[PDB]
Symmetry: D2
């Protein structure tokens, strides 16, 4: 029942990188798995010899496009599953999520009148933090498939270092498919947009989006009338991202680039540090300072303007637009009060970060029926508030970071489908937080396109 | 006061072309100048040695694009001065007309969702027919600058064969400039469309066109957001056309192409035969049958379905879509009754003509103040009727043929500027029929774009 | 305590099965006898196939359809096929440097071949799945069950490692998908750039002992590239590099589990690769391998060695190109340099007369293998070049198209094939003989071969 | 009764005059003495200038700005300038065939030069206005006032025709605009296609008596083009052909009347052409021609013959490139093949030390003219080639850029220059000596020169 891998039995890092990497990893690290060190080492030794998920030239390219976002010349769409699972790492599922991002992106592009950088939560989003080590059933908490199992039994919840290699296998398989898919017919704007027009026809609030959908279609037809063939467009790039949480995994996937040599985390193109692991003197922030990838930090409602500035100065020490993304997650009822003084203070530093809205993690609650859930209207209202904040300051609302899937799940309440607490039981499939289903994700893109237009 | 040209003192036509050309020109020809034959010959001998205004490969290309029009895959915009004059053959004027066509074309392209073929009435529109040889002042009628002078005195109205060479000089100069202009910054869609947005801001009915103007701007911005640079578009082609009226001029500008050899009239890319010279057994129709250029015939209210068919069978004997354009000029109050049976009968033949609306020549009347004029609303209503006719039959409304200028003249009544009979006296500059000024021409394009959309 | 980590293969729910009609066709084909198959228990094989039936595919049908179009152009004399990579991939060497080196060598070869042929070169790597090999003897020189490639057992000369382990099917898939991922990343990186890739060809000329021989062509290629640039052709404005994946379809357990239905018409594609070939020891006309190739939509190839008859050749054409699709079938000649000029012409004539258009591809390696006095299995560069030379002569005489080459190469500076400008000797072989099977052309030899074939395309 | 038709020049209302400040500057410049001007009455000249002030321009400022950018690239060593066409255009020969033949020859030369130089070639024709020439003697060998070109008087050797006729200004404009129209049509026709144009270079090699000499390069160019095509470069996906117009700015009446203001910054452009040069006999440092060149925005050139000093050269640089704009000024060497290697280096060194970047262009014709024993004025192909050879040597020795050539050519198979592969003799000259002024390279000679210069660019 096991495939078995041989433990390799080789370029030394430049002395300074070895020193800084060691210092970063010696700092305290929250939310790490508790598995034996000798077993972790063996797994990392396997991962240090595998082909990388991404390569440095792609990360450099992403950095260039994120700079444009930071400068107000592009918009960032980041999205995908809350938690990828080994079980659902399948072609239909992956294609569903790629398609939903593409569908959203064309609508946002038209509304923003500028390019949309597409970053999927995919090919590595297998680890999550927990506030409690014992869950509501008295079991050790599920921390994602890189760590332990979702099944509600003790043995499955044991931390298993073999999941580090299993997670890489799943991630590299998914990434291969994402690459194949973005240079397939799935890339074509016309294909992708006719999907949106089917969505408009079947949605209960379709008549509401019909005008913009038609306008987009006429735009695409105009492009074609002017002689623009699909043969000669910017062909689709979808980048890979996840939360950099398990440092055993991230450190094993570091590779030294071939103009000074730098350390790149090649488990992804970009990674972010979450609320529970962003300790300013912690290993995760220190790890982010050593790697060359673009990075994000999640900023919740206890964020101060002063700490935001300290993240900016530590994480973008050389003033490189787009290197750092600050991901606002303040709850729809607070975003308007809490965000402006953070934005003002950071902007005064002269650094150019991307300001990205995560309207999901600040707006979750537990339904009467037991399922943890989010209301579509709160998610939409946070994005609305985020846009108001930036428009008042004249700063750039740079992007959104959403949890979505191309499946017709029943996880977040509301939308045009008016998903109720009752409906939640029928198709609740997430291993963790509730995702916008394909219709809700589409509807949000339309709604956000209008915010971009106004 | 004269430049003087030496009379050349040389490839024989294939025997069949010489025979057919001679037969065509021996047939009766209406509306020809009355100047001595020996003087005409000398002028034609000069014109037989000049560089051509157009070349065969451009005419072949136009034919390819007109085929697409005939098949329902493109739309034809034909427009420019009623009568070009030597006096106004200037850079500002020519640029004005090129700009007005470009402005109209972008709007029509967006509305049609397909390419617009642009054919200017330019670089040769120097001759006109007259129903009376003596005009309202008792003078011999002005027949255009290729024939005689506009000035109201006897001597200026004498027919002067030297105007054949003078007309070529003016035509080749204008064509040179048209070519320079269509590969200048004037070509750029963004430039051209910001003009339309200034028009929207200053028009008295601007609020009416604002929505479509914004929609176009968002379409252009989307194109740019998708990575379409102006560097890599279909760069502007504007073709040259005039009424083939003076056979001394047209025959002198024939050239034998270098896959069988054919006769091309290189005074223009396409030419049309007017109402007063379309005698079925006449020299003009017979001349049109010998040349390889695409051709049009104007069809007025006494047109029968049967005669239309005879034109089609004589002028498109080989069934080449786009070779023939049938130009409906029935008056706004008749187009709806008269056009359908012509369309039905021609369509039954299996030939594919372009159906083009000329909403001007069927709707002219004399104002109380003396000036010959047309009402904007009748012009618009004829185009509207033309579209209704085709939509009922499921045939392709292929194009419009309008008389326009990029100057702010006061020649046609109405439009958003509400030009009245009083206003007509202030800026009436046409050597012949009243042209839509730059604002009216633009407004019509918007109106026609909506017909194309509905 | 023995330097291994086990990776749980959790059972996960199955996606919908393939259509009953197509599975009916498949079962009939696979009831045919299959040579050279692993001996592992059926129940274990089934469990592992079940895992593979639900994994993300290595390739997708639209790429296969695109390859088929490019291979049609090859069959019609309008493109040239370059196929190459390791004789056997190993899991141990399935690393970034090794993959990058093989991708690089193939690109280096292709630009030289493109110039020489004055037509596009279709690039198909032996990569992301070449993990199984037949054997003639069930017992090797060490008295062990033979190594059958990493999909089946281990190279290490010990009993435990040599047992047939069906878990290696899944390990094979993990390695194929990781490699394919990287091949995709590399072909859209700076590695794709013609200028970058041809500068490497320039360093090669400067340092090769016989570089003076190739300088003329290398300079001429550089001048061609600079002309492109001078006419205003930007490198982003070219056909961006496609490298397809291929291997020998040997382990039917693996291939059948990697079958998928196209989205739609709908039919079976083997998504473990873009194209696969059938080997000399598994091409029985009524065997399971040919039957499997009949059922799949991918372009396929069949190796043709010196025992081939024109009649059997014709039977392959009738079974595997029944719809007369140009380029769907490639016939790969491996007759030895001393036999190709005699044995190939009758095969070609007979196939051409069928009215089908196959690709005629030259494998100049597998017919020219010998053993050194110092032990190592080896091939002579000159014999390899000479078979391709003879292959061109055959087609030139017949007015037929020499479609392409199929070679075993690596971007490593190994010492596996004798000869080349480096004059690799029998003594030298012991330095870096790293192949887990047949001797490969090293990076210099492979690049030197491309220059030589470029000259053969120019005459 | 004498085979002429008069074309009325109707007076038409004037458009707005040029700005007063700019006309003030112009008047100050044109008060300077002007050599070689027609003697026609001032009042008639004025009337004709008034007509020309309102005609559509020959060129537009955006094309001139684009040329200036391409000429900057030449000045910096990143492109090569090809300038060529008739020594004198005549109204009688300003026909479609003749224009097409000259455009064709220039394109044929440019593709060969592009390959050889491994960089873009800027194509500037001597066309659409080269209708005026200076003379040394006011009385010719027939006892007549000298022919001054068709803008001024008639070639025919009779008194009436030789009188200076200001109507010829308008006839010149009519002919320039007709020619420019056609040049524009031709450069966006199939004549633009690299393949078409290079096939002509292939026929030329096959039939030239010394074609064996050029076959290698011709084949190599063809292989480069086929490589482009093989890498997927479609001919519609290239920089579509631009051919600019130039002539010697000689008749100040014509040039000043063709001045226009750019739309906007705003400044004077001479829209009778894209670029104009000042000749050897009108380049007085304080004369009207240099002053006129100062005032206009177009790129300009100055001919530099064997009397030139480094100091005067430097004065041209200071007057005509006062803002240090690379490529705004071209210095055109015409020192004779026996003198260029001695006379050019001191001029170059001195100009380079100024810190300005001019274009160094070689005119290998006007310094190598002699008369045959059979009467005809002529030039030797070998002397022409040799000046360009010597010009390259000068720049190679100095590390400076040989910017381009300026040659007199036609697409006609005339017999005007001795030598070339056809070995044109003194006897042969009488067959087709058709130039109204200096002897031109015929189509074969001009194409042969391009191969030879291509080799000089390759070394
Ligand atoms: N070198 C691979 C290591 C590997 C590749 C891919 C993978 O998913 C896991 C492990 C092996 O020995 O198997
Ligand atoms: N594998 C990393 C550091 C490393 C070492 C060497 C190298 O080339 C890349 C990355 C660790 O956790 O120490
Ligand atoms: N060959 C021209 C003929 C010509 C050209 C242009 C023109 O506008 C009129 C006449 C000449 O002799 O003048
Ligand atoms: N110039 C024309 C006919 C013609 C003759 C010869 C030629 O090459 C073209 C056209 C005429 O009126 O007779
Ligand atoms: N869903 C995957 C199946 C898989 C994916 C990738 C892989 O390399 C092996 C197996 C799992 O259960 O782990
Ligand atoms: N408006 C023109 C001026 C002109 C145009 C073209 C030309 O070749 C000469 C003169 C005319 O009066 O005729
Ligand atoms: Cl890289
Ligand atoms: Cl599906
Ligand atoms: Cl042509
Ligand atoms: Cl103006
Ligand atoms: Cl079975
Ligand atoms: Cl053995
Ligand atoms: Cl004056
Ligand atoms: Cl003389
Ligand atoms: Mn989440
Ligand atoms: Mn009219
Ligand atoms: Mn092998
Ligand atoms: Mn000369």
């Amino acid at each position: 029942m096991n495939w078995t891998v041989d433990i390799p039995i080789l370029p030394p890092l430049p002395t300074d990188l070895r020193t800084r990497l060691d210092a970063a990893l010696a700092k305290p690290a929250a939310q790490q798995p508790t598995w034996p060190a000798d077993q972790a080492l063996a797994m990392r030794t396997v991962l240090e010899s595998v082909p990388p998920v991404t390569v440095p030239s792609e990360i450099v390219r992403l950095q260039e496009q994120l700079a444009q976002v930071a400068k107000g010349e592009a918009f960032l769409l980041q999205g995908g599953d809350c938690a990828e699972t080994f079980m659902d790492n399948t072609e239909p599922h992956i294609r569903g999520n790629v398609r939903a991002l593409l569908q959203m992106a064309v609508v946002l592009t038209y509304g923003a009148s500028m390019p949309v950088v597409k970053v999927a939560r995919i090919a590595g989003q297998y680890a999550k933090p927990r506030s409690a080590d014992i869950d509501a059933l008295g079991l050790r908490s599920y921390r994602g498939d890189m760590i332990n199992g979702f099944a509600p039994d003790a043995a499955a919840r044991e931390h298993d270092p073999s999941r580090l290699v299993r997670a890489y296998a799943n991630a590299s398989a998914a990434m291969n498919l994402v690459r194949a898919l973005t240079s397939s017919g799935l890339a074509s704007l016309h294909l992708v947009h006719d999907w949106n027009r089917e969505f408009v026809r079947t949605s209960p609030a379709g008549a509401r989006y019909e005008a913009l959908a038609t306008e987009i279609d006429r735009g695409l037809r105009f492009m074609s009338a002017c002689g623009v063939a699909d043969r000669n467009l910017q062909t689709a790039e979808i980048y890979a991202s996840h939360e950099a949480l398990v440092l055993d995994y991230e450190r094993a996937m570091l590779r030294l680039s071939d103009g000074e040599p730098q350390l790149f985390d090649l488990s992804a193109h970009t990674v972010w540090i979450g609320e529970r692991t962003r300790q300013i003197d912690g290993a995760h922030i220190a790890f982010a300072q050593v790697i060359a990838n673009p990075v994000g930090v999640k900023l919740g409602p206890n964020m101060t303007p002063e700490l935001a500035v300290e993240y900016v100065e530590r994480l973008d020490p050389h003033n490189k637009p787009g290197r750092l993304t600050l991901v606002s997650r303040m709850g729809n009822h607070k975003v308007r009060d809490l965000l402006p003084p953070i934005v003002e203070k950071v902007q005064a530093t002269g650094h150019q970060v991307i300001w990205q809205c995560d309207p999901m993690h600040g707006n979750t609650h537990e339904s009467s029926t037991g399922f943890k859930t989010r209301h579509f209207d709160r998610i939409v209202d946070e994005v609305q508030g985020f846009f108001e904040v930036h428009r008042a300051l004249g700063t750039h609302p740079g992007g959104i970071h959403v949890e979505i899937t191309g499946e017709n799940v029943t996880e977040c309440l509301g939308g045009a489908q008016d998903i109720s607490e009752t409906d939640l039981a029928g198709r609740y499939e997430t291993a963790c937080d509730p995702r916008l289903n394909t219709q809700q994700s589409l509807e949000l893109a339309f709604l956000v396109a209008e915010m971009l237009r106004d």
